Amino acid sequence: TIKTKNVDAVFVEKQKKILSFFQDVSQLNTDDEYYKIGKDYDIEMNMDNYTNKKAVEEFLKMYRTGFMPKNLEFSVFYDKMRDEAIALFHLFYYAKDFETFYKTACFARVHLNQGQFLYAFYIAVIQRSDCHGFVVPAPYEVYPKMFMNMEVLQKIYVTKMQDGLINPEAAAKYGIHKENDYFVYKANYSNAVLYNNEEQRLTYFTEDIGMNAYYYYFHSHLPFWWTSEKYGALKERRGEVYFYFYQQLLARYYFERLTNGLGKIPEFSWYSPIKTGYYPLMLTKFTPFAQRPDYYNLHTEENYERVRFLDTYEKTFVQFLQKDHFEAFGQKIDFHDPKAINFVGNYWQDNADLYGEEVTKDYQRSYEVFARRVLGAAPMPFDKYTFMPSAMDFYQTSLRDPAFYQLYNRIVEYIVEFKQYLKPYTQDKLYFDGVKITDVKVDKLTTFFENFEFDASNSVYFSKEEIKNNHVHDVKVRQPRLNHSPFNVNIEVDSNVASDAVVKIFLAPKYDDNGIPLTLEDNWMKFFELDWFTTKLTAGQNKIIRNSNEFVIFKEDSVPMTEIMKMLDEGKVPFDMSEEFCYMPKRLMLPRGTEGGFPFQLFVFVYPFDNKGKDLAPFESFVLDNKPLGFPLDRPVVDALFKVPNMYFKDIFIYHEGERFPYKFNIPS
Amino acid sequence: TIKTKNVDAVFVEKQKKILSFFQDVSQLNTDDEYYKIGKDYDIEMNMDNYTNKKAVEEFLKMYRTGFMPKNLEFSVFYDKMRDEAIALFHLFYYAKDFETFYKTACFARVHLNQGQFLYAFYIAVIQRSDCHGFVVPAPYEVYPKMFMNMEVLQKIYVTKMQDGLINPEAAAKYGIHKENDYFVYKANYSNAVLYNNEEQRLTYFTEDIGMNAYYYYFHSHLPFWWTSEKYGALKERRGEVYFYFYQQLLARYYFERLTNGLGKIPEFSWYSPIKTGYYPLMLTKFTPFAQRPDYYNLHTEENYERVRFLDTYEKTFVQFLQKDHFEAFGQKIDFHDPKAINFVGNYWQDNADLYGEEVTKDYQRSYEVFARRVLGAAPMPFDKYTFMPSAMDFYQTSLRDPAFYQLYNRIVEYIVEFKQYLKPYTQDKLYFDGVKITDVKVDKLTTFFENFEFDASNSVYFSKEEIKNNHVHDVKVRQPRLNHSPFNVNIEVDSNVASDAVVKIFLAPKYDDNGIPLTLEDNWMKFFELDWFTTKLTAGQNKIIRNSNEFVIFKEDSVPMTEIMKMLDEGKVPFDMSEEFCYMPKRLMLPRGTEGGFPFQLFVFVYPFDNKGKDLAPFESFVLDNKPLGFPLDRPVVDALFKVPNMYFKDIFIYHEGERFPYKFNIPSY
Ligand SMILES: *[C@@H]1O[C@H](CO)[C@@H](O[C@@H]2O[C@H](CO)[C@@H](O[C@@H]3O[C@H](CO[C@H]4O[C@H](CO[C@H]5O[C@H](CO)[C@@H](O)[C@H](O)[C@@H]5O)[C@@H](O)[C@H](O)[C@@H]4O)[C@@H](O)[C@H](O[C@H]4O[C@H](CO)[C@@H](O)[C@H](O)[C@@H]4O[C@H]4O[C@H](CO)[C@@H](O)[C@H](O)[C@@H]4O)[C@@H]3O)[C@H](O)[C@H]2NC(C)=O)[C@H](O)[C@H]1NC(C)=O
Ligand SMILES: *[C@@H]1O[C@H](CO)[C@@H](O[C@@H]2O[C@H](CO)[C@@H](O[C@@H]3O[C@H](CO[C@H]4O[C@H](CO[C@H]5O[C@H](CO)[C@@H](O)[C@H](O)[C@@H]5O)[C@@H](O)[C@H](O)[C@@H]4O)[C@@H](O)[C@H](O[C@H]4O[C@H](CO)[C@@H](O)[C@H](O)[C@@H]4O)[C@@H]3O)[C@H](O)[C@H]2NC(C)=O)[C@H](O)[C@H]1NC(C)=O
Ligand SMILES: *[C@@H]1O[C@H](CO)[C@@H](O[C@@H]2O[C@H](CO)[C@@H](O[C@@H]3O[C@H](CO[C@@H]4O[C@H](CO)[C@@H](O)[C@H](O)[C@@H]4O)[C@@H](O)[C@H](O[C@H]4O[C@H](CO)[C@@H](O)[C@H](O)[C@@H]4O)[C@@H]3O)[C@H](O)[C@H]2NC(C)=O)[C@H](O)[C@H]1NC(C)=O
């Protein structure tokens, strides 16, 4: 009941070497051969084993100067740390073949900082062509400390320090149980100990382990600091991809807001206090994460120069808008051209493609970075390697901070400003000659919470003894997560001539906060894409059934590594972990319903699938179409020029079943 | 089924006379009896027909000076207008008998400002002993401009200016119909044209006409400026009525917040911006009301001296709290004494009883007055009779403004700080020997919206012909209003020995915003009294059935004045308008539910009714007990010390049926 895939001899060996690097991540097994290789591995001597002579040499210059020390906390948002990560990445990426790649990782495991290494290695496995189709573990199994509050962490430490339970019945009262040879820890979301404002209503979504894993994967698939030359025709669509990822996410987030009675993400000002604080319960081996109190003055002394930069970055965009056509960064740009999204997105991201370069440079200040830093409310870094981490210093923690959504909402709104320059689609562009959707029905939509466990053993240090006996996997975290029942969408379509067609499904809200029905005019960016697929219509009447379990845009829960070691002994590999790893998890498709049925709408659009003109398959198997991302809702709409027979809006209601509140799953006795 | 009451021809005559002063309020019928008496009436010559000679002369002195001109807006919140209102009230109240009273109203309607007159007259009818049992129209029938936005108002005006509909079918699409000889106007709540913040979710409550008229009723029953000498032993409990009135109302408001997903009423500072604004869509005669933008700085140039006053008022109270026992206002007060609540409430309302005087004075500056003026964001009055009205200048519009609830929550919070000094009740105080509640059961609790019409004719000006011909009642306003289904509360009590008993029923929330069950300790002031009554227990097993419809804390909807004239020809008067006018309306009892059923809980309490030592019937039969208002939840609680077998906590859910959004009742069909 987990989507499998079969696998040969050479594959399993490599995959085992790859997975070796994600276990006991913060320690070293002296007896493991990865260590014997690693200790003595000579990079200079091996120079002929890399595609890029200057990458080896650049790495070597940095490595003698000195890399970040071990145990210190790694973040890519800081110059020196990132530069070392990139130098390391290149070395992984330009290794002639697997053997060389493997050995280089061995050395790097042994000699360099843990976070820096996993960061670079993870990315490398995703980017190397010979590695395509291999599997990596879930971010939460690799970095467990970042996916869980203190309370849990500390129970784990205590149990480990005691080598078990002094009182099993007392431990039980704290949600700690022995299940055969596992220690299982129940975990509440933070609102169960902290309700310091209404945003805490959303913790089952913002603290969700999958959602946060999802953002991490997105970063890794194409990090901002690197070109996208490797992905070919997506290079000319990179900005579009950046807008759409964020647009989709904020729609999804917004949906969660609506169902907990919260409305719009609030606007903010670099020159004013920001309302909602963030009080993180994460610990770092060396420090606590930094808090932002409520009404925090973003314009305090330490931030003056920072705010001057950020304000100018924005103002420079506002200038672009005002002048329509202009030259910036070596490019004549026209805001009338829909292709300009590429520039717009690239600018807001300060990625390598903005400059037409392979890697970004220190003097090219990113807006995202400094915005993250200021809103993170940290004191000034002590030095190049010693900073006070906030949620927004890591891709694995960002979604936890309401301020993150404020920051990307603002960015998305500026891109929407650019999108106002595009002419709206006319009838002719949308009309599907002789095709009409006559009905849509939907099975009941119910959400519900359900326990989920993940391997949390990397959070813990084992003894020399335990590392040798390989007893390194006995810590699991149990947590209630959002889920929903599978559902069919029944679509009835009429057409004169048989034809190849594209079907698209979107989710959007039905009402604003006041209970007025949504116009497309104001609300086209609040539509969330559920699925696209192709069918063949016949003359007459058509019945199209599509199940939620088969929506192209979502993945299944990933499998724990231990379960993957099991499968590799059988020649099996978890399919969704191989090629669908960076999709949103299925269980989070729907926002949490209400007991009464919260009102939403399904938008179904059917259009002709002409041929395979402009065709994305290098980055994402997403857009085998000539069409903008989120077509037909990638620009302003006029309600009356828009609605055509091959469109259907269906009113639907999202229900919720069982326990309403995650914490009711975590009570003892 | 409108609960009736029979009456004699002498009553009928007097009642007609009282009603006449509420028709065509802003105009004068030269042809009517009231005008003939009025024009010519000589007060000085009739000195001997007043109980109090000094009041007649106090009034004559002011009236020679000049009173507020006609047509300006009247508010009791300004010194000079208040003083005129009161000198007038005194004239009404000290009239020897009804004849003199009547003739005096005639004079006052002819010569004085309409608002000032209606104000004084309304209170007079309530306060005068020989008028006890008589009936007054609902405040929305008398001040209809105060219970409606300007959209409806302008349609009413346009129709009147045209003397009909130029296009019935086009009028239909604006929600205007002739029905009989009436023009009927559908009206939405303001959120239908205005969603300037989350607080607009609560419009069907805060704008509700009964809810608003109810506040007006509370004030008229016992205004701050006047003594409560006339209400017997109420005098010793005035501050208690003050607190409880607001505590209850704020609990009820809070429920509406909860069921609309909004949580707690926010705290503010006279030195900081206040976040949520108020954009009123009401009109008066020669101005709109004042707007308060979001983030309005309470501490601007114009408010400096006001805030210094307001700030000192509060801190003086804080000083009381720190001192425990003090001498103030010529009274020795001890905050450990539960009776101190009288002083505490009197202090916050700054009422006549704080000083032991008949009537408050200009030099006794009121807190509520100055807070209202500050948060209303109006500019300085032009002069003693010309101000810019805000919702908070009137009892009939205050509930409309978010700031209103913030202000009274602040006061109520301060009174709650005083209640911290009170010893929590022990087991022995609450335990009813040999008595146990074994089950509580409740029919389905379900709200719905439902069309209600009222007479808005006082909003219009009529011609010479129409006034002469009594064609002066043709404007109706129809509006969806909250209601709920009737329901039964089934209570099974066990007692060894037969005994007379009191049963109380409260409503409370189940959870906070995080969905933790609310504990009694923090939330004993979040409880809303639904009913109290007595039964006779017998040895063994008891079953008490109480319909919501028999809950004594609430009244039925007022009848229009039009149906009262018809009734008075049958010798009948509407009972709930006579004896129960100042109770909360029944149909707003429950907060608007949810389709899935929002969680609350009932608290049911049963205790001994061995005699009737101290009981109130001068104000009205509310507290037939020497028990505090809101007993056993009138002081703070310790969960373990509290739970007793004659209490029962039952979980309930409040549903909503049919349309959830009122505007869906107001769409024209095509
Ligand atoms: C545009 O703006 C301007 C500026 O604001 C507006 O101007 C205002 O207009 C008002 C009229 O609407 C006016 O008020 C009236 O003034 C009358 C005259 O006031 C003087 O005299 C009186 C008393 O008279 C005696 O005085 C001397 C001194 O002893 C003697 O020697 C004389 O012989 C007299 O015996 C003084 O008291 C004043 O100080 C002035 O000097 C007022 O008398 C009149 O008062 C009446 O109205 C009051 C309320 O309506 C009422 O309380 C009072 O008892 C009076 O009642 C009489 O009048 C009513 C109708 O008003 C009538 O039906 C009764 O039968 C009764 O006889 C007014 O108060 C303002 O003075 C003026 N403001 C200024 C600054 O000049 C202007 O209206 C506006 N225009 C438009 C189109 O909007
Ligand atoms: C309490 O607080 C203090 C203050 O912050 C902490 O003190 C710091 O501790 C760290 C140790 O954790 C020290 O770093 C070490 O410094 C050593 C020497 O530093 C200098 O010399 C390096 C070596 O070169 C020398 O060569 C010749 C000798 O023949 C001389 O001519 C010359 O002067 C040089 O000194 C230089 O390269 C360097 O620039 C320094 O100026 C280092 O030997 C040592 O390096 C090792 O460790 C690295 C770990 O990342 C690794 O990269 C290297 O490969 C190498 O093996 C090490 O870094 C800081 O010097 C010290 N700071 C200060 C200001 O004194 C203290 O740790 C803390 N205590 C606790 C308990 O928390
Ligand atoms: C109280 O508040 C409610 C909530 O706003 C008000 O409800 C609105 O009333 C208005 C105007 O009276 C309603 O507008 C009419 O909708 C008609 C039909 O439904 C539409 O179908 C169309 C046409 O294709 C769709 O495109 C729309 O989206 C609608 O669903 C429509 O027939 C009608 O058209 C008329 O006006 C246009 C002007 O451009 C002309 O072209 C045409 O000839 C015709 O005269 C109206 O637009 C509106 O729907 C109601 N609001 C909601 C949310 O439903 C109440 O009116 C208020 N009640 C009072 C007394 O004020």
Gap between the Cα atoms of B359 and B351, Å rounded: 8
**Which of B200, B260, B595 minimises the CB distance to A596?**
B595
Ligand 3 atom index nearest CA of A517: 53
**Which of A513, A514, A596 minimises the CB distance to B596?**
A596
Gap between the Cα atoms of A333 and A326, Å rounded: 5
Structure tokens at B289: 């009301």
Structure tokens at A107: 């050395």
Tell me the residue type at B164: G
**A594 contacts on B by Cβ (under 8 Å):** 594, 596
Residues near A537 by beta carbon (within 8 Å), at least 6 away in sequence: A435, A493, A495, A498, A499, A500, A501
Give distance in angstroms: CA of B33 to centre of ligand 1.
29
Closest to A251 measured CA to CA, from A588, A627, A578? A588
Q: For the packed helices B33-40 and B98-111, what is the interaxial angle rounded to 10 degrees?
A: 80
Burial class (CB in 10 A: 0-12, 13-18, 19+), B383: exposed
> Which helix (H) or strand (E) segment is B67 a member of?
none
Gap between the Cα atoms of A292 and B1, Å rounded: 61
Q: Are B84 and B75 in contact (CB under 8 A)?
A: no
Ligand 3 atom index nearest CA of B192: 2
In terms of CA atoms, which chain A residue is nearest residue B192? A514
Q: Are B555 and B583 in contact (CB under 8 A)?
A: yes
B311 Cβ under 8 Å from any chain A Cβ: no
Closest to B57 measured CA to CA, from B94, B108, B106, B13? B94
Identify the three-state secondary structure at position B374: helix
Ligand 2 atom index nearest CA of A69: 50
The answer to whether A512 contacts B195, with C-beta atoms less than 8 Å apart, is: yes
Residues facing residue A442 across a β-bridge: A489
Closest to A480 measured CA to CA, from A178, A191, A120, A180? A191
In terms of CA atoms, which chain A residue is nearest residue B193? A514
Tell me the residue type at A543: K
Q: Where are the beta strands (DSSP E) in B289-434?
A: 296-297, 325-328, 331-334
Pocket of ligand 3 (CB under 6 A): A 516; B 173, 175, 186, 188, 192, 663, 666-668, 670
The answer to whether B198 contacts A597, with C-beta atoms less than 8 Å apart, is: no
Domains of chain A: 1-188+451-481+558-571 (no CATH), 189-421 (1.10.1280.10), 422-450+482-557+572-669 (2.60.40.1520)
- The two beta strands, A182-186 and A176-179, are antiparallel
Closest to B404 measured CA to CA, from B634, B396, B242, B343? B396
> Which helix (H) or strand (E) segment is A202 a member of?
none
B293 Cβ under 8 Å from any chain A Cβ: no
Burial class (CB in 10 A: 0-12, 13-18, 19+), A595: middle
Q: For the packed helices A98-111 and A79-93, what is the interaxial angle rounded to 10 degrees?
A: 150
Residue nearest to atom 13 of ligand 3 (CA): B667
Which of B59, B70, B385 to mutate for ligand 1's pocket (most ligand atoms within 8 Å of CB)? B70
**Which of B262, B597, B663 minimises the CB distance to A595?**
B597
B660 Cβ under 8 Å from any chain A Cβ: yes
In terms of CA atoms, which chain B residue is nearest residue A259? B261
Resolution of the experimental model, in Å, one decimal: 2.8
Which spans in A48-97 are helix H? 53-65, 79-93
Q: What is the DSSP string of A647-665?
A: EEEEEEEEEE-S-SSGGGG
Tracing tokens 């000589």 back to the chain, one arrives at B42
Q: What is the CA radius of gyration of chain A?
A: 25
For testing the chain A interface, which of B513, B663, B667 should be mutated: the one with the most A CBs within 10 Å?
A: B513
Give distance in angstroms: CA of A62 to centre of ligand 2.
17
**Which of B514, B596, B663 minimises the CB distance to A191?**
B514
Ligand closest to A111 (CA) is 2
Structure tokens at B373: 């003026």
In short, whether B69's Cβ falls inside 6 Å of ligand 1 is yes
B267 Cβ under 8 Å from any chain A Cβ: no
Pocket of ligand 2 (CB under 6 A): A 66, 69
Could you tell me the sign of the dihedral formed by the alpha carbons of B629, B632, B633, B636, in that order?
positive
Tell me the residue type at A381: P
B263 Cβ under 8 Å from any chain A Cβ: yes
Ligand 2 atom index nearest CA of A68: 50
Q: Are A501 and A552 in contact (CB under 8 A)?
A: no
For testing the chain B interface, which of A190, A202, A514 should be mutated: the one with the most B CBs within 10 Å?
A: A514
The answer to whether B660 contacts A515, with C-beta atoms less than 8 Å apart, is: yes
Ligand closest to B659 (CA) is 3
Q: What is the DSSP string of B589-635?
A: SSPP-BTT-EEEEEEEEEEE----SS---SS-TT--SSSPTTTTSSS
Q: HSE of B188 in the Cβ direction (CA atoms, 13 Å)? A: 19
The answer to whether B515 contacts A663, with C-beta atoms less than 8 Å apart, is: yes
Distances (CA, A) of A198 to A261, A436, B261, B401: 9, 44, 10, 23
**Which of A192, A263, A515 minimises the CB distance to B661?**
A515
In terms of CA atoms, which chain A residue is nearest residue B660? A515
Gap between the Cα atoms of B430 and B607, Å rounded: 7
| Residue A274 main-chain phi, psi, to 5 deg | -110, 135
The answer to whether B261 contacts A261, with C-beta atoms less than 8 Å apart, is: yes
Give distance in angstroms: CA of A66 to centre of ligand 2.
11
Ligand 3 atom index nearest CA of A639: 26
**Which of A263, A514, A597 minimises the CB distance to B191?**
A514
Instruction: Give the 3-state secondary structure percentages of chain B, helix then strand then coil, rounded to 5.
Output: 40, 20, 40
Ligand closest to B189 (CA) is 3
Q: HSE of A582 in the Cβ direction (CA atoms, 13 Å)? A: 18
Gap between the Cα atoms of A174 and A155, Å rounded: 8
Residue nearest to atom 20 of ligand 3 (CA): B670
Closest to A553 measured CA to CA, from A576, A537, A520, A573? A576
Residue positions counted in chain B: 670
The answer to whether B514 contacts A596, with C-beta atoms less than 8 Å apart, is: no
Give distance in angstroms: CA of B69 to centre of ligand 1.
10
Q: Are B654 and B594 in contact (CB under 8 A)?
A: yes
Distance from CA of B599 to the nearest CA of A (A): 12
Gap between the Cα atoms of B478 and B267, Å rounded: 36
Gap between the Cα atoms of A565 and A515, Å rounded: 52
Distance of CA A314 to the CA centre of its chain: 25
Residue A358 DSSP label: S
Phi-psi category of residue B14: left, alpha or beta, with phi > 0 → left and psi -120 to 50 → alpha: alpha
**A515 contacts on B by Cβ (under 8 Å):** 660-661, 663
Identify the three-state secondary structure at position A92: helix
**A262 contacts on B by Cβ (under 8 Å):** 261
Distance from CA of B262 to the nearest CA of A (A): 7
Gap between the Cα atoms of A300 and A172, Å rounded: 47
Tell me the residue type at B617: A
**Which of B201, B515, B660 minimises the CB distance to A660?**
B515
Q: Are A372 and A306 in contact (CB under 8 A)?
A: no
Give distance in angstroms: CA of A89 to centre of ligand 2.
27
